[PDB]
Amino acid sequence: NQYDNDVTVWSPQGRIHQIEYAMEAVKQGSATVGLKSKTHAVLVALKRAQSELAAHQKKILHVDNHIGISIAGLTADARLLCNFMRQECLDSRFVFDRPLPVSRLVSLIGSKTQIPTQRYGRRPYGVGLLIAGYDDMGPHIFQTCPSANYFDCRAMSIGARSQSARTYLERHMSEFMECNLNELVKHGLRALRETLPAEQDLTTKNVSIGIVGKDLEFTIYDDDDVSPFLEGLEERPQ
Amino acid sequence: ERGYSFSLTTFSPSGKLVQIEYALAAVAGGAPSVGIKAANGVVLATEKKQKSILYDERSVHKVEPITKHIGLVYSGMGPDYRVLVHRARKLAQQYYLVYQEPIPTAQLVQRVASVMQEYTQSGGVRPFGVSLLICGWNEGRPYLFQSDPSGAYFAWKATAMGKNYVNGKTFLEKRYNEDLELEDAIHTAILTLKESFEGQMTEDNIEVGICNEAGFRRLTPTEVKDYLAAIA
Amino acid sequence: GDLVGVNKDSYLILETLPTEYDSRVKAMEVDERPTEQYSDIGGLDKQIQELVEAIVLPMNHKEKFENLGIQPP
Amino acid sequence: LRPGRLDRKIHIDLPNEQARLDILKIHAGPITKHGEIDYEAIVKLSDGFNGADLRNVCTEAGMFAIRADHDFVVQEDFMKAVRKVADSKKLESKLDYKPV
C-alpha cells in the first residue's frame, strides 16, 4: 500500500495505481451515450438531481460550431479542460481562418493531460470526455480517459452502469449507418434505458441531446424540445 | 530542481547538531598531517601513501599553493578538498582586483569559513568532511590557522590532524617549544610524521611545503630525500 | 537400530517389530482422498500441463524418460 | 577459522566459459540426439549459471522432446531451454560472500 501514494512511484507489478484510482472516478458520474451515422453524429446524455427542488446538473456543452463534448467525473477538471478546449478552437480560427479538424485537437488534449500524470505533486484529470464533431471527412466519435488514451470509436458509453449500455450497441451497430436522424436519435436513447432502475426512464427533466450535422450547427436540446424526440417509444419488457 | 531548499541539519533534543559531529568522524579517519609555526616560517607536512606500486606520484598533490605567500593542506576526504580550493583561488582574486594588494592570511579564513558555515545551514546538502591548515608569512610575522567542517577556526602554534592526532598532540607539546628555526621545525615535523607512518619513509611517502618571508615554496622530492638523512 | 520384542525376564529377542515414527508424522498421512477433477479448475490450462509433465509422467511412464535417458525433474 | 584447526581455505566459484562448456559436455552425454549440436552458442547465452543450472538445461530440453513424442533431441530444444532457465534467475540474489 505504501507504493500506492504518488503518481511518480511505479509498482513492483508495474501498474501506477493513481491512474487506476482515477478510472474509478469516471465510473461514479452519470451515464451518456454517443454514436454516429454516415452523415450525422448524435450524443445523448443523462442528468441527475441533487434534490427535488434543485435543478439537474447539465452534461453537454457547446464548444465550437461543429465540436461539442460530453462530460463524466469531476467538475473542476470539466471546466479546466473546457477553457483549454474553447481556447484552442478560436486560435486556429484566428490564425488559419479555418475550423480545427477533430482528430488533431484531441491529440493536443493527450499532450495536455500527460504532464500532470508524470511530474510530482500533480493529480491526473478525472474526466470522461466524449467528443463529437466534423472535420472535412465526416463525423467522429472520440472518447478519452485519465490515462490519456484517446480512442477513435463508433459508439461508446462511459459512466455508471455503462456495462449494459455497450451490450445494446453491437447488436445494433450495423443499423447505425443507413438510418437518418429521427430513428438514429431514438436508437441512442434506447441504450440509456438499460442504465436505469426499472421504474423511471426519461421524463423530460434528465435527458439532453446534442446533434452535429452536414447542414447543421451543433445544437443542444433540453427538456422542452426533447419532447418531440421522446414520442414513439415502446416500454421496457419484463 | 524544484525549490525544496530545506536544511537537513536540525538541532537535537539535547541541543546539538548531529550531522556536524558525524562529519568530524570522517575527518578523524583521514590521512595524518602536521603543521608547525617556528619564528621565521611555517612548515606543513602530510602523509601521502600510494595504495599500490602502480600509482603515479607527480600527478596528485597535497601541499597546494593559493597565492605566492599562502599555502594550504588538509586532512579529510579527497574530492571535497578540490572544491573549496578552487573557491579560495577565485576568492583571493577579488581582493586583489579591488585592493591591488596581496590578501592577508587572516582575511581568507574570515571568508573561507563563511562559505563553509553558510553551506551547512543551507538547504539539501551535507556539510564538508575536510579540515584545513592555512599558512602564510604576511607582514613579517607568519601565521598558522585551522578551520573545520563546523565552520569554526582557530590559531595554533603547532597542531596535528588526521589519524592519531591526539598522540601527535602530546608529542608536539613535549618536543616543541616557544621558538625554533625553519630547519628545526622540519626535523620535528617528520618526527611526528614518523610516529604514525608505515615502515619505509621515502620521498614519496611524505610531502612537505614551507613558508618563508621570501614566499610560499613547495619542496621537491630531491631535497626531501636529502633531508631524510638523520630521519625523524 | 531396530525395534524388537524382548522377553521381560530372560531378555531374549522374540519378535521383530515394524519401525514406528513420531506421532505428529502419522497425522500427516492422508486417508480421505477427496475429489477435485480437472474440469473444476478453469483458466489455468498451461499450468496444469507443466504440473502433469513434471510429476504424473515419471510416476507412470518411466520408459518414456529412459528411452531418451536423462532424469526426472 | 584460525589455521591449525582449519588449515587451507579452498574457494569454489561460478564456472568460466570453458568451464560452462565442459560441464555442458558432461550432462549431454547419454542424450539421444542428432549431430547438429552447437555447444558454443548455448554457452554464449550461459552467464553466471550453476553446474546444477546446466543440468537443468539438459533436463528441460528433454522435456521439449517429450512434447510431440520425438525421442531424438533437436538442437533448437536447447535454446528454448536456455531462455526458460535463464528466465527463472530473476528470483535469486546475494550469491557472493567475503571469505572468513
Added chain:
Amino acid sequence: TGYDLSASTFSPDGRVFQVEYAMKAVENSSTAIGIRCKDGVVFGVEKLVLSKLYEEGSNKRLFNVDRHVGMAVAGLLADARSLADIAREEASNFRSNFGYNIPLKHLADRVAMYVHAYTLYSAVRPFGCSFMLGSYSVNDGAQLYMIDPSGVSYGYWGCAIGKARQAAKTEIEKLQMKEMTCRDIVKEVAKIIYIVHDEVKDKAFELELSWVGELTNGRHEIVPKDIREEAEKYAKESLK
C-alpha cells in the same frame, strides 16, 4: 523494499528498481517486431481488437517521425505519443540549423539522452515505453535501432518487443536476411505474427505493416494494405 521508491536511490547491491519495474511494464503489451532487408526496413505490429472498441484505423502504434524515419512503439501508449512529439521536434531543429535530413544515428542518441534524463531525479518517473527506429538512405543504407526504458540504444538486424519477445525472435534468426528483398519480407513478417499469439488469450487480433526502403524512394509510408492482400493469404498457409 525500502530502496525501490525513488529513482535517485541505489539498492544495497547496486541497481535501481524503478527502472527495473518499468521494464516489465513494457513486457505486458502486445507484440511488435521489426526487421530489415538489404534495401529497406519492414515493420510489423500485432494489434488486438477487444470486442469492438474502435473504428478500425484508430490509435495505430506505427507513428511517423520524419519523412524517412518511422516508429514502432509498444508498452504504455500515452508516453509513446510524447516521445513521438520529442522526435518530431528534434528532427525539425536539425533541419533548421544544419539544412539537411537527420541521420538515424544522431536521432537515436538525442532521444536516448532524453529518456535517460528521467531516470536521475525523484521529481519525475522513468518512461514505460520501448520502440523501434527504421530508416533508409542511399548514402547510408537501411538502419534499425532499439531503445529500452533505461536508455540503452544500439542497432539490430531484427528485434521484437512485447509479451512474445524471446519466443518471437527464435524464428527471426531462422530466416535469411542479407539476400532478401523487402517485398518478399512483407509476406514473411505476416507469418511470424500469425504463428505466435494463439487465440486462447485474445480471439481477435489485427495486423499492421509499415514499410520504408528503396522501393518507397526513401519516404516512409504504410504498406498498400487492402491492396494486394498477400499478408493474410500467405500467413494462413501455416495450418500444418
Added chain:
Amino acid sequence: SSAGFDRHITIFSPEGRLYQVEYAFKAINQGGLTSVAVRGKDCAVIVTQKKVPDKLLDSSTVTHLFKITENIGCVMTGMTADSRSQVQRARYEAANWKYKYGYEIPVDMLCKRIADISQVYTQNAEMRPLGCCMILIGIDEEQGPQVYKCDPAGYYCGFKATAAGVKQTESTSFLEKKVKKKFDWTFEQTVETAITCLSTVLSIDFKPSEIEVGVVTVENPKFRILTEAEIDAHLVALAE
C-alpha cells in the same frame, strides 16, 4: 547500522561513512566486463573485450571505445546509459577549451573537469551519482603518454598500467608482478602484455573478434582503433 536516512540519501553515517557512493562502486560490476590500460615508454594501449550474445545484434554498435577528441580516446565501464551521457559531457567541455583558450586541452585537465562535475552529484542530495567509470589516454608535449581514471566518487590519479571493470584485484595483482621486474617497454611489448594479462585473468585464448584495442603513440598522436586483421597479427605474434 541505519541512522536517520543514511542508507537512502547522501548524508553521513555515525561512523563517518556514506553508503550511496560505496553502493555505486559495485554498480559498475553488473556490466560483466573488464577493461585494461597499459602505458609504455612511447605508447598507451587500451584493451577491452565485448560480448555479442545475438546474431541479430550488430557488430559496429557495441564498442565502448569512444573517441573524445583527435588525440584523446577513452573506454567506459559500468552501465551503458550512464556511460554514454558521461561522454557528451566530456565532448562538450573539450570543445570549450578550444574556444576559450585556443590551444588543445591536456588529458590531465579534462579529468579535473569531470571529477568536479561528479562531485556535485555526490555533493547535492537530490540527484543520482552516475555509476560508471572513466579511463583516458593521451599524449602530452614534454610529458609523454598518460593514463588517468575518474570515479563516481569524483577523484582521479595517474597510473602506469591499471585495469578496471570486474577483475581489478586479479589484474592489478598480475601487473605488480609484471611491471616492477625491470621491463623495458617497446610498442609490441606493451601490446603483448595487454592481451596476456587479460588472457590469464579470464582464461580464454580468444578469437580476434571479441576484443578491441585503442592505441596512441608518439609517432602518430591521433587516437586509433585497430582492425581485426592487425589485431590478428599481434595475437599470433604472442602465439609462439
